Amino acid sequence: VTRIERIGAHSHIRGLGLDDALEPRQASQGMVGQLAARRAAGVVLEMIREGKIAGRAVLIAGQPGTGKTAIAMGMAQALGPDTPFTAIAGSEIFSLEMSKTEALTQAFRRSIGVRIKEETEIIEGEVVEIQIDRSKVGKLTLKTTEMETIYDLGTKMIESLTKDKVQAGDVITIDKATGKISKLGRSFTRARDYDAMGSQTKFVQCPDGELQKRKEVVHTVSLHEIDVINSRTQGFLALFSGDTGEIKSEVREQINAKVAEWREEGKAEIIPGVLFIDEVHMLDIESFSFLNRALESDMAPVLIMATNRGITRIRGTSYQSPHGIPIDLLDRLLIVSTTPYSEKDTKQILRIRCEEEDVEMSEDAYTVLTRIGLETSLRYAIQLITAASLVCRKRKGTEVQVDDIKRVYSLFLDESRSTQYMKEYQDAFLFN
């Protein structure tokens, strides 16, 4: 069937295609060429995996179509799902709700994962009888498939039981430390054959084993999530809505100290990750200035960046800088350069894309498509792959031939041909 994840521009990339020595293979895990860049990405990935050094910045620079986003996706895939990888675009930090520095702080704190581990003693059973004598004192009877006992209740326990409307046949768990009661379900009996059921009620089997149990919960949350939780009374709702606002710096410092305390106590572990900003040239000078000193924190993740700009103008200024990034930040980062692909590399990438899309092509078709990709662009050839597949299927064919590629080349224009046709009719178009 068709799941929500479908064939995209980088669905064929499963990793960086490196060996144990970080030497890149010619074609492995969906990556072709870019040997030096892939080796550098592997070095950065080992640095990330070690996790010892904080606030390391890497810039993936190169011409458009040279595999910068491909290399970033390869790094993200090679890194386990355990380690956080926040991928944002440069435009996403311009928010009407929070400042640019607040957006960058939230992105940074989303990239550090905190794995929590809480062990709690609980009582778990099905409710048999609740007797309350006169809201002062009472008794509660709980049972399992192998056990049954009666409990003496106090004032607060009685109040909690009455507030939750706990009755007979309900399957409940009680936290010994805090006394909070959550209802798992209710037992099914011949008399509970309801014709309509409420939106929250569900029938579950009576628990087995022993009435007293230990509950171990292990989950991974980010620092930003803990900040949002502790920002306000019901801050966890902002973890869904996103109406976080600007979190106070004092709260963040308190949460950092508490997380360090948990790490010392053995109740939490830190997993520093990666923040990938694609097309960083859209960041303004204020964002770069904030990044300069944000990377200097002890709770700063690895910042991987990617731009395809030459010596251009920094946004928010009138100055020209080698990547659109002020040279002060560029001195804080290592630059990984991607080289343009050759004919062989382009053909191998086209083969991988065709295999990913399940398209059969003849060798002459591959030669023509590689020539087109070199002449126009690699992405144009990738699109022509699917266009030619559609045309071939329309004429009840099974293998894409040169005729299909020529047909889709005539039907769909690249940038150069479209620009030429526009120049032929320049006066027709508006606001030249």
Partner: protein, 445 residues
């Protein structure tokens, strides 16, 4: 703390007892004049008798300005407040820039409060009124004391209290065998549950049964609490804990920084002065570090004039690596450090110079020691040669990739070949700029 950051090796200013700067001490190398000036500034901060004084650290990028500020913070200690801040932080969607600056100013002024908290813990063993043989008014019984017996792990004491405590005892529903605590400074009884020795395994209460208190019945300790003026200001502007409709609205509504008025700040200042006069609190004026001051606009600088002219302001440290740049918010106005000359007239300028190759090699060795990396002499010389061109940051940033490459290769030290391979793999700013210039047609914009 366990992770190694860029200034993890700076443990303070390497100053002799006479103030002269040692060539290499406390993680700092070179910058002797700047370190001596920073030591003078540290003495100024410790003197606690000056307000609003400003110091600007001016120099080329990568010359130790942030390192010098952090060394100042280390020299002061954790007692002295140190509020780091970048110039980009004044642009907020909730409050105006002047409000952000004022809030950081109040964050830098700290207050240390010392108080003695005396409490009486124990399990109530006895509750006996002390009647008087002559009842006032003739009828009934009159009582002059209420004897409360308190039992702890290592003792038992009896306290003859005021008769008025009977109402508090009844309100708290205190009976025999319950654990209570009485505060001397208030004379109030609070029931912190019942003793656990009277609880059975068949009970289900959670917060009702408490362990018998350890230690002595009479516990007194000195509580030292460090707060800042901004903490009090914010806690009073948006109070938390009330039961009125306004507190409920505050809990419901999204938190938002507000423009705290001069009335509240004056009230807080009066309360702090009263506390100081009473002897409860001692003022601890700290430092506000504003890095990348050039990112402030003309409005922020103008407000900074009045901010620094105040008698409550902390000692502010600026830092700028700009030359004759154009002030933000102005149209073609150039100033020597990106700062208008009016604010430069109000600061003391500390110049940071570039590092000689020997100092660069020393810094590389120190950084390698901090990161737990063993580097050979030939590799160190090659990396210093790499640092003579490019920059110092590039050289200190090639250390960990080279260590990883050596570990993969199976070596416990960085050799020259590893550094050469890392240099081949990663480009610096100048090499990347040369590549971009050589292919300016193929790139975008």
């Amino acid at each position: 703390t366990q992770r190694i950051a860029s200034h993890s090796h700076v443990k303070g200013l390497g100053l002799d007892e006479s103030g002269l700067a040692k060539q290499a001490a406390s993680g700092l190398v070179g910058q002797e004049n700047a370190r001596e000036a920073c030591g003078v500034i540290v003495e100024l901060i410790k003197s606690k008798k000056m307000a609003g004084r400003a110091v600007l650290l001016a120099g080329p990028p990568g010359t130790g300005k942030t390192a010098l500020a952090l060394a100042i913070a280390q020299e002061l200690g954790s007692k002295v407040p140190f509020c780091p801040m970048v110039g980009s932080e004044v642009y907020s969607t909730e409050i105006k820039k002047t409000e952000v600056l004022m809030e950081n100013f109040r964050r830098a002024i700290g207050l240390r409060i010392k108080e003695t908290k005396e409490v009486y813990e124990g399990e109530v063993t006895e509750l006996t009124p002390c009647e008087t043989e002559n009842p006032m008014g003739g009828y009934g019984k009159t009582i002059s004391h209420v004897i409360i017996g308190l039992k702890t792990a290592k003792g038992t004491k009896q306290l003859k209290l005021d008769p008025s405590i009977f109402e508090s005892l009844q309100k708290e529903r205190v009976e025999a065998g319950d654990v209570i605590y009485i505060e001397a400074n208030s004379g109030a009884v609070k029931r912190q549950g019942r003793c656990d020795t009277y609880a059975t395994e068949f009970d289900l209460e959670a917060e009702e049964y408490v362990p018998l208190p350890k230690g002595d019945v009479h516990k007194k300790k000195e509580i030292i609490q460090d707060v800042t003026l901004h903490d009090l200001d914010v806690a009073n502007a948006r109070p938390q804990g009330g039961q009125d409709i306004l507190s409920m609205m505050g809990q419901l509504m999204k938190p938002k920084k507000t423009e705290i008025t001069d009335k509240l700040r004056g009230e807080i200042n009066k309360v702090v002065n009263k506390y100081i006069d009473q002897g409860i609190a001692e003022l601890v004026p700290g430092v506000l570090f504003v890095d990348e001051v050039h990112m402030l606009d003309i409005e922020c600088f103008t407000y900074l004039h009045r901010a620094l002219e105040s008698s409550i302001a902390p000692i502010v440290i600026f830092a700028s690596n700009r030359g004759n740049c154009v002030i933000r918010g102005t149209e073609d106005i150039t100033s020597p450090h990106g700062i208008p000359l009016d604010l430069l007239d109000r600061v003391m300028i500390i110049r940071t110079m570039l590092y000689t190759p020997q100092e660069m090699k020393q810094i590389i060795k120190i950084r390698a020691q901090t990161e737990g990396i063993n580097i050979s002499e030939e590799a160190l010389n090659h990396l210093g040669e790499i640092g003579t061109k490019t920059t110092l940051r590039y050289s200190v940033q090639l250390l960990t990739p080279a260590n990883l490459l050596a570990k993969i290769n199976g070596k416990d030290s960085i050799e020259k070949e590893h550094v050469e391979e890392i240099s081949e793999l990663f480009y610096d700013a100048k090499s990347s700029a040369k590549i971009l210039a050589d292919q300016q047609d193929k790139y975008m914009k």
